[PDB]
């Protein structure tokens with residue numbers, strides 16, 4: 392079978408409500424750790440979000456993934472192996488305007504930045520309804 | 536809308552007995568809930584939310600019973616998805632109504648949990664510290 396993901400819901404960068412930093416991958420390969428960093432106009436910070444729940448990095452073509460299988464731990468880019476821990480929903484309940492939380496299908500835990508200030512490393516954590524867990528899809532070419 | 540976008544009332548939540556502020560330890564707006572001097576910090580600005588949760592201006596956190604029986608009340612993450620549970624919802628009970636030295640009419644009421652059906656309470660009939668839930672027994676310290 393040719394694997395379908397459904398449509399194409401979004402294509403952009405993810406700017407953090409708390410810090411205005413961009414959801415970023417280390418280096419510019421599009422592979423490895425995911426962390427918060429300055430918005431840079433590189434393809435490694437652009438993601439495609441599909442109906443099936445996958446967030447696919449535009450540079451590397453691979454999935455926003457959580458360590459192991461539980462849906463709890465560090466987040467990085469990893470092969471898309473059709474698992475539920477690589478699938479995310481965007482519940483309207485945890486939005487504030489255009490800034491929204493990403494809820495992991497395997498653990499009902501939120502895409503999260505360590506601490507309260509939305510500046511550190513990116514993993515999953517309990518949905519706490521705090522600005523540092525909320526991201527806006529952005530379509531500009533802005534840099535810092 | 537992860538925030539309380541429809542507040543019924545915002546201000547200092549005082550005890551009818553002691554005239555003291557219901558307070559969260561520290562100034563972050565997370566932690567244990569107990570009475571304390573009114574220090575004018577935003578964590579003491581309590582939000583009586585239209586959805587029935589109780590929150591504060593310092594942090595998007597809910598007045599939460601720390602158990603299922605007669606438990607302590609902490610300020611912790613709001614469970615907002617799939618929907619706010621009954622354990623984190625509250626309602627007005629009976630209401631004493633009075634006029635303070637400011638010449639302003641205030642309305643003190645019981646604050647009843649919707650899961651346990653119990654009352655927001657301070658230890659004894661005037662401690663004057665640690666807050667939790669208890670049985671509703673019409674003492675002027677279970678009125679806020």
Ligand SMILES: OC[C@H]1O[C@@H](O[C@@H]2[C@@H](CO)O[C@](O)(CO)[C@H]2O)[C@H](O)[C@@H](O)[C@H]1O
Nearest residue numbers: 415416417418419420426427428429431
């Ligand atoms: O926030 C971490 C940053 O990491 C850099 O990653 C690469 C490392 C490893 O080789 O060293 C560079 O050569 C430095 O430019 C990078 O290729 C990224 O440049 C930053 O964008 C950022 O991801």
Ligand SMILES: OC[C@H]1O[C@@H](O[C@@H]2[C@@H](CO)O[C@](O)(CO)[C@H]2O)[C@H](O)[C@@H](O)[C@H]1O
Nearest residue numbers: 456457458459460467469470472474476
């Ligand atoms: O490192 C990210 C990847 O983690 C894998 O899980 C690892 C398993 C063994 O494969 O054991 C750990 O070392 C600790 O639990 C994990 O690093 C996942 O299978 C991959 O999907 C990926 O998430």
Ligand SMILES: OC[C@H]1O[C@@H](O[C@@H]2[C@@H](CO)O[C@](O)(CO)[C@H]2O)[C@H](O)[C@@H](O)[C@H]1O
Nearest residue numbers: 503504505506507511512514515516519
């Ligand atoms: O798993 C990350 C979690 O980090 C918490 O913040 C921690 C505090 C207390 O240890 O200090 C740090 O070391 C700063 O990075 C963190 O480990 C956050 O409050 C949680 O929301 C969560 O992200």
Ligand SMILES: OC[C@H]1O[C@@H](O[C@@H]2[C@@H](CO)O[C@](O)(CO)[C@H]2O)[C@H](O)[C@@H](O)[C@H]1O
Nearest residue numbers: 558559560561562569571572574576578
């Ligand atoms: O009894 C709790 C009180 O806590 C005060 O905050 C204290 C600050 C003082 O800088 O530092 C701590 O020790 C913790 O870091 C707190 O205990 C608040 O100012 C009071 O409002 C009150 O909540």
Ligand SMILES: OC[C@H]1O[C@@H](O[C@@H]2[C@@H](CO)O[C@](O)(CO)[C@H]2O)[C@H](O)[C@@H](O)[C@H]1O
Nearest residue numbers: 656657658659660661662667669670672
């Ligand atoms: O959890 C407190 C509850 O129990 C009673 O208050 C206790 C009495 C014990 O006789 O004295 C204290 O030690 C206060 O100094 C309390 O632990 C009350 O009858 C209940 O209303 C309730 O507050």
Ligand SMILES: [Ca+2]
Nearest residue numbers: 416418419435
């Ligand atoms: Ca990068």
Ligand SMILES: [Ca+2]
Nearest residue numbers: 457458459460
């Ligand atoms: Ca995984």
Ligand SMILES: [Ca+2]
Nearest residue numbers: 504505506507
């Ligand atoms: Ca965090």
Ligand SMILES: [Ca+2]
Nearest residue numbers: 559561562578
């Ligand atoms: Ca305080």
Ligand SMILES: [Ca+2]
Nearest residue numbers: 657658659660
């Ligand atoms: Ca009492």
Ligand SMILES: [Mg+2]
Nearest residue numbers: 424425466513
């Ligand atoms: Mg990471």
Ligand SMILES: [Mg+2]
Nearest residue numbers: 568608666667
């Ligand atoms: Mg308490």
